[PDB]
């Protein structure tokens, strides 16, 4: 897949494109074997693409310069230069992992520099072959007659080594490198590079390496990522740095830091561990584009990562993700079919969307320049929906002027009026729930029979788990109505720890005695309260700080607020079950109607809950389609 309407060109064409190779004061147009590590940026209207020019071989340990192409016509035509050249000291002299920051009309490029080491940088025993260099480009725009003509003057690189400490909290240092791709200017004007760093134990980890003074001098924030986080990419989001890391053979870790990387906190309630590196999350990781942009007046993030069905380092099926830090939408595949396409950089300029990404066959790497027309289409469509539901809900005037607004902060998923034969549609278009034995009713579904119910997938989302936040905190809200008295004790709503629904984290059931059975974790279940057949009730499950609550009609049940997470291990929620288990495997027959399921990524406060309870007649999506 590349969208309908989208298109591309082979901009850095492997074993074809030539570059001004300078050595001993003579320049030669030289063919390049492979191009890798793309970074696509916009400098004051001038599109600039920076990458690895790997001259003879694709290998990381080979002769490599840093190539820059720039266009003044949104990528129709380009000029080519080398921005940073290596030492020429040996056949493996190289400037590696170029990482780019744009500020004003200046391009700050940060590269590793090696002279003759043949082993991978992380396995080195000391820093003898290494320098870290900062080179700056000045971008200029002239206009003869009608015609726009740019030029970029590159500075001689400067070593930043003097800013590299001997010791970081309780370990000794070896080397460090940029995260590759595009870094940022913090809203306070600091230059911020997320960097990968090795200690003497040859562990890798990520830090924040920043300059407060336009890159004259550089500091490291005190804290770090966990070990094995490499190739970090960062963006700034509501005053915090969000650092998104490659972790080989594990799911991507994401961190927040409000204090320029002095303290790092794992973003468990949003994006951390959402993205897996491969279906089974058991393969090598990747370089990711991760940018904050404003599209259709909404502030959003765009993330890319290959799905890597092939496994090993092939990294086929480059995917684009859209997030508002609440909802996570898979825009789709950007690469074309089963082609290998790992590293990527996404640029949003003048309301048009572009991507510079790798294509790899047989370890010969090109970079394509893709006009993501169809992708923007979808993005714009999804945002519209998000804006509209959110608007719709805030717009509701609640019961006794108007009461407090319906909350949409941390509102992630909404199951309401729209449903297909086998699926209940998320209003926010991110994660549907599947259904069986479901009959459509206003704003929800009537279920009946064995195996009846709806399943909202959590860990069961598979390779990318957008709902992973629920393991730390969530609120699940729904309107329910019971139509038949059960022969045992039947399920209504809950968070399942196993794929059958047997083992629950937190849930609600109802019994033959006309009582509620709130289930807190593995705690012996004590039935409480009473319900009558055919009356509609408001059900709220909240879980935060390992404690679960259950509210009926906005009142917590007796015995509510118990520990559901015994050890200090994290839960791994299988799915949410609604109106049954949706397993023919379980013997229960839940005959109920559920309406307006809401999912929030935090615990709702007493007032937000109470609002929702009074508003249950007017939150539904029925009218609006």
């Amino acid at each position, epitope marked *: 897949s590349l969208a309908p309407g989208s298109s591309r060109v082979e901009l850095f064409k492997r074993q074809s494109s030539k570059v001004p190779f300078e050595k001993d004061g003579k320049v030669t147009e030289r063919v390049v074997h492979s191009f890798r590590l793309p970074a696509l940026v916009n400098v004051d209207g001038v599109m600039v693409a920076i990458a690895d020019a790997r001259y003879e071989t694709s290998f990381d340990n080979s002769l490599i310069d840093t190539v820059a192409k720039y266009s003044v016509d949104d990528g129709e035509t380009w000029e080519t230069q080398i921005a940073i050249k290596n030492s020429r000291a040996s056949s493996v002299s190289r400037v590696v992992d170029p990482t780019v920051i744009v500020k004003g009309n200046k391009l700050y490029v940060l590269v590793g520099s090696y002279n003759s080491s*043949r082993s*991978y940088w992380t396995s*080195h*025993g*000391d820093a003898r072959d290494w320098d870290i260099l900062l080179a700056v480009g000045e971008v200029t725009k002239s206009t003869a007659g009608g015609k726009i003509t740019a030029s970029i003057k590159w500075g001689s690189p400067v070593s930043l080594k003097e800013f590299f400490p001997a010791e970081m909290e309780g370990m000794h240092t070896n080397q460090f490198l940029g995260g590759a791709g595009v870094a940022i200017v913090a809203s306070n004007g600091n230059l911020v590079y997320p960097v990968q760093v090795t200690n*003497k134990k*040859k*562990q890798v980890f990520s830090k924040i390496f920043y300059s407060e003074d336009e890159g004259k001098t550089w500091k490291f924030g005190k804290g770090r990522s966990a070990f094995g986080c490499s190739e970090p990419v960062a963006l700034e989001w509501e005053g915090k740095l969000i650092i998104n890391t490659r972790v080989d053979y594990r799911r991507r870790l994401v961190y927040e830091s409000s204090d320029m990387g002095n303290t790092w906190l794992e973003a468990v309630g949003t994006l951390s561990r959402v993205w897996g590196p491969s279906p089974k999350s058991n393969q090598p990781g990747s370089q990711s584009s991760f940018t904050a942009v404003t599209i259709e007046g909404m502030r959003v993030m765009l993330f890319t990562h290959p799905l890597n069905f092939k496994g090993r380092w092939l990294r086929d099926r480059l995917n684009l993700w859209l997030t508002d830090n609440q909802r996570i939408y898979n825009v789709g595949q950007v690469s074309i079919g089963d082609e290998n396409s790992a590293y990527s950089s996404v640029l949003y300029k003048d309301d048009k969307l572009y991507c510079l990404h790798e294509i790899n066959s047989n370890e010969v790497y090109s970079l394509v320049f893709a006009r993501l027309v169809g992708e923007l289409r979808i993005i714009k469509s999804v945002l519209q929906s998000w804006k509209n539901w959110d608007s719709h809900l805030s717009s509701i005037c609640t019961p006794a002027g108007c009461g407090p607004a319906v909350t949409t902060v941390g509102l992630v998923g909404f199951l309401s009026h729209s449903a297909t034969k086998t699926e209940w549609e998320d209003a926010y278009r991110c994660v549907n729930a599947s259904t069986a034995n479901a009959e459509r009713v206003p704003n929800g579904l009537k279920f009946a029979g064995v195996g009846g119910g709806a399943l909202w997938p959590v860990s069961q989302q598979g390779q990318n788990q957008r709902y992973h936040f629920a393991n730390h905190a969530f609120t699940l809200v729904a309107s329910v109505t019971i139509h038949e008295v059960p022969k045992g004790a039947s399920p209504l709503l809950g968070a399942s720890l196993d794929s059958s629904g047997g083992k629950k984290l937190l849930g609600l059931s109802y019994d033959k005695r006309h009582q509620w059975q709130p289930i807190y974790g593995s705690t012996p279940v004590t039935p409480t309260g009473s319900w009558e057949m055919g009356k509609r009730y408001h059900v709220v499950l909240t879980m935060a700080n390992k404690i679960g609550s259950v509210y009926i009609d906005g009142e917590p049940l007796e015995g509510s607020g118990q520990t559901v997470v015994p050890d200090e291990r994290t839960p791994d929620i299988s799915h949410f079950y609604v109106g049954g288990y949706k397993r023919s495997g379980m013997p229960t027959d839940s005959r109920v109607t559920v309406n307006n399921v809401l999912l929030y990524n935090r615990q709702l406060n007493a007032e937000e809950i109470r609002t929702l309870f009074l508003s249950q007649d007017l939150i539904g999506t029925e009218a609006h389609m």
Partner: antibody
Amino acid sequence: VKLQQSGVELVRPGTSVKMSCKAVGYFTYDWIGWVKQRPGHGLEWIGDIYLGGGYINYNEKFKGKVILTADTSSSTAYMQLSSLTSEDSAIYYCARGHYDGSYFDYWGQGTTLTVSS
Amino acid sequence: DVLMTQTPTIMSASIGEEITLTCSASSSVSHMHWYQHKSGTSPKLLIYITSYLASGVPSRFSGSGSGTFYSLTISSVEAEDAADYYCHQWSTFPSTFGSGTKLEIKR
């Protein structure tokens, strides 16, 4: 470049020994590592110590037993083994762990240790 | 502790023929080293960083491999090539050696 280790050792269980590994053809700053070779047991990595830096990486299996040191003026590394047992009876080799991916190219001649009553 | 599994334990090879030894890492590493060991001597470095030939080692010895599985090959074996062979990674701590494969000559 070369590594010259100390002489044959014979000791009663429970004592201590300190092995040397000094290089002639002297080079400037590097990791010197230690390997235990026992029959039936291939080669076991003990640890490296960094001549002209002091940094050490211990293999945790040997946490109690081994203490590494280095006099970087005379450029000699010392391995010391505490509270010995027939377990520790082996040939001990030192070698230099080249910076470029840490391979051991120059090895010592080996120091043979015998722990017996 | 990436564990290095060298299979099989003992391998036979006829004079002048080629043979390959394997080394199978529990987890991915940047590269392998290979050593020859004959009891009484010290270990001898044969291949460093996966594929480069140590100085003075005869070019019948070849090195290949990638990520999780590496190979040592003798172009055409010599009587004297009967020995123990060890693979070795030091790409993550702690450094670990192979289980070792012994070469027997067929005659």
